[PDB]
């Protein structure tokens, strides 16, 4: 709070680094379905028999 | 995050320590123990020789390994107090002008004007000649006059508790 | 951070008051140790009239130029430090590192043993050690002929006494109590400040993220209103305790500056100030956050009673002793 | 006899190294008497069972020392009928079975031929105490916990200890097995219980009973107490002391 | 409560600060009763060097002392001995140095 | 009392401070008065030169 300062040291503010991205590792490996296997069976059926 | 060498027992997951700070975790996938530490911080300060003589400054970051992590000038230097940028570490020694810490003092001196930081010197090195039989008797003296300043008393003050707190309002 | 502005400028003095304490601790170390203008050193030979000074003079075999007596003091004082830097709390290093603290102490020893006491009042003037002790017996009320007629016996009495000091510290665990309680009170105050973060102070939770997330903003401000003042009063108490404690050290720092000025740079006639008995001389020794003195005193013993009379009449006229007692 | 130091468990799932901590959780108080609870249970003639009903005073600490499979299981519940939900735990030799489902009443082991040990050793008589009910809940089959390390030539006794407790609905089961030489009940030494099984089944529980197959165990009640746990090296509870047993313990907790 | 806290802080700061001043006031009272009304043999109490006398001077909220001291100079080395033996008996100086 | 424990450790600070004051008062009497090791006794007759 002046235009003239004397010699010495003067603390002004503080230095803080910043985060860059985010990391989320939820539980391992993962849970999964076998209904996708149905897709790779082969043949189907009748029309009154959907 | 960083690698952890501390061995966990299988059931427990967290790594809390003295007080309430979390100190270690385990990977939710592949089950690997990790270590944590807060990323660096600190205060900044400005070393100046005054606006009367010049305008160059040399700032300082406290407790930051600037070799390990970049802060983002004239030069960079490592000190136990922190990292100093804007001055060069001259090898000679003089008296102290602006203290920094861990025996480092800076001043605005020529080699054509720049800010330098050196190592503190406690004074001129002197020796005496001790001997089995040697005395030195002075032959002339000097009547000196020093000075000394001492505070005695401060300024008397008094307050009015009702008037200050309540601005002449009967509700307050 | 926005909520902190409506309270005003409370922590501006809190940063200002702790700055004044910090600059004071770099001033207390100044006048206790830097009482001299030039750094002296002892000559390579170390025959001081038959007095053994190896325990207090520096030993250059170790990397740090310290003495064997103060080396024992360093191991005894024990300092966690890691967790304190993790909540915005900082520990600034001292201006004078421990190497030059030992160099001021080594300078005070060199001026004392070689130049006597005259280096505290002008230029240093050398004088052999057996005559310097003759000028300190002369200031307690005994005559110079006592010392040289018993020079060898006093030499063994001094040499054996200084060896007992090193074992005295190691045997007693409560020896360095005063220095230990200094670092204990600082670390214990810091841990009580950090553990205040877990307290809720009558709020929903002690984590600021949970208050913002689990509850809506319109009544989140009144919840963190009670949380801030609980944390603020904990910070206010720490400074007030530090302000009172800093004044107590300054009372001890000024007393230590007096003892170095009088008991070291001269012979003091104040009874039981320098030591227990008639005072002769002293020795300073550095220590972690403190100083240790080695006072050398004088104690009579081996009494013998006699019969006395206060005057003598010879030719009708009374006679009184010039300096002494009629026995 | 009186329990000496047993009855301590890990309260949470947190790793702490070389620290002193204070705990407020429910615990078995130090130096408390335990009832012997001997049941002959020889299964002779019509009915010789020595099972009374126990009041379930804030969780149960259980200790036993069988040879292979003498002590079998548990029922927890209040009315012990199909009216109310009842826990049942059975340690089958292959895998444990846990059934929360309501059962009318437990059945009985077979009152077979009097030669119970002469020549009758064939593994059989699944005496099926489980019954049938409609509103029926989920089951928690997992690895057996009553694996026995073989005791050869005596002086080996795999002591089994388990703590069952209920906090805010959740049902916690803690287990440990100590294969130590023992000739006296609850021998000296310090042993800390690991957390094993958690149940998110919130029902009222005030009563429990034990299954013994056949064809000896100590039960204690937990109380709210404050202890001083010590964590050493890799989060191992080397010791824990009370805060209300004697004035010296009070000073130890204070300092 | 915010405004009443301000007085509670302000009074506490003045009480601590007034204790520091009284410590300086007692030191000034001792110096006036030893460095002015007599001669003090305490080393580095009435100024650096051997002390002679002092002069008080008034100041706004303080006092200024003008210590008059004594400092030797112009040293020259000599050869000495602890005593003197004349007729088979030692002779010791009463007030001086055998130079 | 269920609210005071919830506020943290504001009694331990004010119980460790009054204990430090109280033990300091007993210390103060020791340096002022107990400056002698042995206890001397006055003679019965009390003629101290008038």
Curated annotation (Swiss-Prot), chain B:
What does the UniProt entry list as the effect of changing residue 124 to V?
In strain: Beta/B.1.351, Iota/B.1.526
Q: What is the effect of changing residue 139 to I?
A: In strain: Alpha/B.1.1.7
Stated consequence of mutating residue 111 to H: In strain: Eta/B.1.525
Glycosylation sites noted in the Swiss-Prot or TrEMBL record: 52, 65, 91, 110, 132, 140
Other comment: Variant D614G has become the most prevalent circulating sequence in the global pandemic since April 2020. The mutation is associated with higher viral loads produced in cell culture and animal models. It would not change pathogenicity nor neutralization properties vs vaccination. May be prevalent because the mutation increases virus transmission in human population.
Protein family according to the UniProt entry:
Belongs to the betacoronaviruses spike protein family.
Name of protein: Spike glycoprotein
Q: Which residues of the full protein are shown?
A: 552 to 749 of 1273
């Amino acid at each position: 709070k002046s235009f003239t300062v004397e010699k010495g040291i003067y603390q002004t503010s503080n230095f803080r680094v910043q985060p860059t991205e985010s990391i989320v590792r939820f539980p391992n490996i993962t849970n999964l379905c076998p209904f996708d296997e149905v897709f790779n069976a082969t043949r189907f059926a009748s029309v009154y028999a959907w | 995050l960083t690698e952890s060498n501390k061995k966990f027992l299988p059931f427990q997951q967290f790594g809390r320590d003295i007080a309430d700070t979390t100190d270690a975790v385990r990977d939710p996938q592949t089950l690997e123990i990790l270590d944590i530490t807060p990323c660096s911080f600190g205060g900044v300060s400005v070393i100046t020789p005054g606006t009367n003589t010049s305008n160059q400054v040399a700032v300082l970051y406290q407790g930051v390994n600037c070799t390990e992590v970049p802060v983002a000038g004239s030069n960079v230097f490592q000190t136990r107090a922190g990292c100093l940028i804007g001055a060069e570490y001259v090898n000679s020694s003089y008296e102290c002008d602006i203290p920094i810490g861990a025996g480092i003092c800076a001043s605005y001196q020529t080699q054509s004007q720049s800010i330098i930081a050196y190592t503190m010197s406690l004074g001129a090195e002197n020796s005496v000649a001790y001997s089995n039989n040697s005395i030195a008797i002075p032959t002339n003296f000097t009547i000196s006059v020093t000075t000394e300043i001492l505070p005695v008393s401060m300024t008397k003050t008094s307050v009015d508790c009702t008037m200050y707190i309540c601005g002449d309002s009967t509700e307050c | 951070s926005n909520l902190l502005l409506q309270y005003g400028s409370f922590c501006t003095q809190l940063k200002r008051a702790l700055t004044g304490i910090a600059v004071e601790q770099d001033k207390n170390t100044q006048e206790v140790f830097a009482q001299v203008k030039q750094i002296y050193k002892t000559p390579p030979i170390k025959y001081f009239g038959g007095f053994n000074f190896s325990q207090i003079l520096p030993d250059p075999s170790k990397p740090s130029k310290r003495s064997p007596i103060e080396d024992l003091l360093f191991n005894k004082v024990t300092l966690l430090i890691c967790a304190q830097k993790f909540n915005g709390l900082t520990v600034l290093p001292p201006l004078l590192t421990d190497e030059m603290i030992a160099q001021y102490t080594s300078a005070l020893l060199a001026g004392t043993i070689t130049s006597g006491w005259t280096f505290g009042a002008g230029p240093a003037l050398q004088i052999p050690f057996p005559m310097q002790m003759a000028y300190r017996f002369n200031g307690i009320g005994v005559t110079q002929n006592v010392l040289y007629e018993n020079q060898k016996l006093i030499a063994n009495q001094f040499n054996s006494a200084i060896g007992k000091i090193q074992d005295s510290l190691s045997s007693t665990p409560s020896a360095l109590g005063k220095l230990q309680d200094v670092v204990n009170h600082n670390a214990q105050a810091l841990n009580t400040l950090v553990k205040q973060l877990s307290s809720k102070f009558g709020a929903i939770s002690s984590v600021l993220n949970d208050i913002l997330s689990r509850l809506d903003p319109p009544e989140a401000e009144v919840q963190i209103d009670r949380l801030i003042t609980g944390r603020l009063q904990s910070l206010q108490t720490y400074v007030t305790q530090q302000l009172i404690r800093a004044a107590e050290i300054r009372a001890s720092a000024n007393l230590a500056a007096t003892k170095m000025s009088e008991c070291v740079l001269g012979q003091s006639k104040r009874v039981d100030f320098c030591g227990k008995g008639y005072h002769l001389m002293s020795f300073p020794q550095s220590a972690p956050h403190g100083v240790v003195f080695l006072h050398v005193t004088y104690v009579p013993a081996q009494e013998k009673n006699f019969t006395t009379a206060p005057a003598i009449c010879h030719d009708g006229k009374a006679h009184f002793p010039r300096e002494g007692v009629f026995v | 006899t009186n329990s000496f130091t047993r009855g301590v468990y890990y309260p949470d799932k947190v790793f702490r190294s070389s620290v002193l901590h204070s705990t407020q959780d429910l615990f078995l108080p130090f130096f408390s008497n335990v009832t012997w609870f001997h049941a002959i249970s020889g299964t002779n003639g019509t009915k010789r069972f020595d099972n009374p009903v126990l009041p379930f005073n804030d969780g149960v600490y259980f200790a036993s020392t069988e040879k292979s499979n003498i002590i079998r299981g548990w029922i927890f519940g209040t009315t012990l009928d199909s009216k109310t939900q009842s826990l049942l735990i059975v340690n089958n030799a292959t895998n444990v079975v846990i059934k929360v489902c309501e059962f009318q009443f437990c059945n009985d082991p077979f009152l077979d031929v009097y030669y119970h040990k002469n020549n009758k050793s064939w593994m059989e008589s699944e005496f099926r105490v489980y019954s049938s009910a409609n509103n029926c809940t989920f089951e928690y089959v997992s690895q057996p916990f009553l694996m026995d390390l073989e005791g050869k030539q005596g002086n080996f006794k795999n002591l089994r200890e388990f703590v069952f407790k209920n906090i805010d609905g959740y049902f916690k089961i803690y287990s440990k097995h100590t294969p130590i030489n023992l000739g006296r009940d609850l021998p000296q030494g310090f042993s800390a219980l690991e957390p094993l099984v958690d149940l998110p089944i919130g029902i009222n529980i005030t009563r429990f009973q034990t299954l013994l197959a056949l064809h000896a165990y100590y039960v204690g009640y937990l109380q709210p107490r404050t202890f001083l746990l010590k964590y050493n090296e890799n989060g191992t509870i080397t010791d824990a002391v009370d805060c209300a047993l004697d004035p010296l313990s009070e000073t130890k907790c204070t300092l």
